[PDB]
Write a protein that binds this ligand. Structure first.
Ligand SMILES: [Zn+2]
Length: 134
């Protein structure tokens, strides 16, 4: 589900990028060839984030937890394969992009500028800032 916010923010920074790229593991939402980095915009429910957007469904609970667990394992392998290929990976969680605690365009823009152009190690952005992936 292509993120409007991010396409316009990346465009404003002067960067060229590909979107929803099926040629790379995980089909990353945005790919910036010039800086060897890819960006995923993950939903907090489907990818099992630890924030307030994560809610356990009251119906077929076990089924849902098993399914979302499998999504997480698949995400870990896609991220490892990308890194083995030489890509840096950023995950921007949904809680940073939409809803009550979302970042301002200014805060979000500054974190993107430093991470892309400063060649930061793989990381993830949430409502509390930027964190390494490992
Ligand atoms: Zn979240």
């Amino acid at each position: 589900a292509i993120e409007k916010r991010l396409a316009s923010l990346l465009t404003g920074q002067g960067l060229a990028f590909r979107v929803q790229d099926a040629s790379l593991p995980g089909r990353p939402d945005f790919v910036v060839d010039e800086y060897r980095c890819v960006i995923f915009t993950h939903g907090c429910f489907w990818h099992h984030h630890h924030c307030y957007l994560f809610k356990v469904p009251a119906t077929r609970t076990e089924f849902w937890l098993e399914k979302i667990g499998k999504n997480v394992e698949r995400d870990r392998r896609d991220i490892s394969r990308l890194q083995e290929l030489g890509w840096r990976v950023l995950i921007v969680w949904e809680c940073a992009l939409r809803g009550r605690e979302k970042l301002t365009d200014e805060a979000l823009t500054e974190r993107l500028e430093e991470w892309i152009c400063g060649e930061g190690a793989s990381a993830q952005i949430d409502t509390q800032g930027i964190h390494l992936l490992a």
